[PDB]
């Protein structure tokens, strides 16, 4: 009390205080190199003089020096909070390597002098946030998409699937689609423009072949104008649904891995048959890339066509989908029973970074 909640992602950092409705400070997980030194949005504005660095790739920390800088910026510049005076809740990807779990614990205690910390699996926090202890979470962010079967509060690690296609790949796909139109979005800022185009204008086609026919005939019923920062207008037509379609058919961008629905189906099949029924009934979407309109209905139809006859399929798509991980964490670290769940400074000093394991 009061616990700090930090959800570290491949592209975005979700941070705030335990007991809040939402994260108060949401900023990109980027380091700007003209060490570091520019961190956050300030590395996006003065990006013309710097080169961008991402300490987290596909949900996994690959640079601990830069990661440690993101944390310092999170505490000092964003939350404006002394970390040695607060317990800190962190998040990790499913199947996170133990070396990174120990390094994360080491940094918090040794570099930040944190009184107490705890690490939660992201998918689990999302399920909790939806008010469930059992279900299959489809976490889909900027750098990685995870399919996590969870039973009675614990992930089933052998059934977890991972695909490295996500939001960033979709952004580049849209850039590719705009390239064949004559445009040349290539720079740092230009990539950010297209990303905004994707978030604002895109949607999931219920029937892709039918929508593709519709856009080629009644084109006016799909076309939307987008105002570029220079004032010019670009027409966006079939790109609106062709871009997020790659989530269901990755072959569009030249990937061999199966689509979102197939990968979820195979995870369910890797689970005990006695729980598959409950998993179909509790499919929970999380992450920014699951925000596309009509994605819940599309997935629902896809899963039904794969599932056994008369199987009940429910896809839950919470409006706060982008922050479900943080929210689940805020609730978790606010509970009266979580006081004794923390890993204390005392427990670290006589066990080391190997303390995270239980």
């Amino acid at each position: 009390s009061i616990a700090l909640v930090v959800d570290n992602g491949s592209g975005m950092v979700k941070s705030g205080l335990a007991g809040d409705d939402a994260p108060k400070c949401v900023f990109p997980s980027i380091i700007g190199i003209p060490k570091e030194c520019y961190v956050g949005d300030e590395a996006q504005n003065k990006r013309g003089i710097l080169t961008l660095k991402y300490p987290i790739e596909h949900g996994i920390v690959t640079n601990w020096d830069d990661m440690e800088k993101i944390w310092r910026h999170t505490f000092f510049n964003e939350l404006r909070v002394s970390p040695e005076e607060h317990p800190v809740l962190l998040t990790e990807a499913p199947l996170n390597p133990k070396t990174n779990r120990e390094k994360m614990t080491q940094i918090m205690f040794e570099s930040f002098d944190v009184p107490a910390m705890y690490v939660s699996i992201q998918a689990i926090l999302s399920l909790y946030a939806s008010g469930r202890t059992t279900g299959i979470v489809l976490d889909s962010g900027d750098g990685v998409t995870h399919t996590v079967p969870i039973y009675e509060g614990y992930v089933l690690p052998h059934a977890i699937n991972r695909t490295d296609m996500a939001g960033r790949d979709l952004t580049y796909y849209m850039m590719k689609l705009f390239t064949e139109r004559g445009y040349t979005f290539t720079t740092t800022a230009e990539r950010e423009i297209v990303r905004d185009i994707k978030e604002k204008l895109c949607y999931i086609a219920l029937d892709y072949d039918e929508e593709l026919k519709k856009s080629e005939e009644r084109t006016e019923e799909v076309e939307e104008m987008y105002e570029l920062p220079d004032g010019n207008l670009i027409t966006v037509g079939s790109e609106r649904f062709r871009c997020p379609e790659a989530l269901f058919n990755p072959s569009l961008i030249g990937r061999e891995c199966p689509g979102l629905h197939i990968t979820a189906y195979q995870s369910i099949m890797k689970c005990d048959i006695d729980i598959r029924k409950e998993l179909y009934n509790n499919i929970v979407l999380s992450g920014g890339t699951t925000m596309y309109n009509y994605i819940g209905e599309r997935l629902t139809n896809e899963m039904t066509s794969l599932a056994p006859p008369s199987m009940k399929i429910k896809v839950i798509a919470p409006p706060e989908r982008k922050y479900s991980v943080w929210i689940g964490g805020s609730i978790l670290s606010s509970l009266s029973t979580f006081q004794k769940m923390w890993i204390t400074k005392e427990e670290y000093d006589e066990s080391g970074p190997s303390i995270v394991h239980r």
Binding site: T133, E152, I331, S334, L335
Partner: protein, 122 residues
């Protein structure tokens, strides 16, 4: 250790807690079965096996007007209480008006509902 966990599953019977501002608070026995539709509850049913051991069924009940912190806490409390019971409890998610026959059978005169409840912890 949370004092309510220590009271949990000591003997055959029915135990009900209501989530109140990020905490588990025991419902007074005379109010068992009368659920605030604006709240979330945790219910432990303990049954003596025919061999000395105890049987555990954990039911978390979600009112239609309960807030996200309450429903979230109820699910988390359920896992934590199951952990305390060495994972030997079977967990059940109960929705208002769609409760399982087992959960309904716990209350002889049937489930009652009433508007209102404790305010959100958020």
């Amino acid at each position: 250790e949370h004092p309510e966990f220590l009271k949990a599953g000591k003997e055959p019977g029915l135990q009900i807690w209501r989530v109140e501002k990020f905490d588990l608070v025991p419902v007074p026995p005379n109010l068992y079965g009368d659920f605030f539709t604006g709240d979330a509850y945790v219910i432990l049913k303990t049954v003596q096996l025919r061999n000395g051991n105890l049987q555990y069924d954990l039911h978390y009940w979600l009112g239609n007007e309960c807030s996200q912190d309450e429903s979230g806490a109820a699910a988390i409390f359920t896992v934590q209480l199951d952990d305390y019971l060495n994972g030997r409890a079977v967990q059940h998610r109960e929705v208002q008006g769609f409760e399982s026959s087992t959960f309904s059978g716990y209350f002889k005169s049937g489930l009652k509902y009433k508007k209102g409840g404790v305010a959100s912890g958020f």
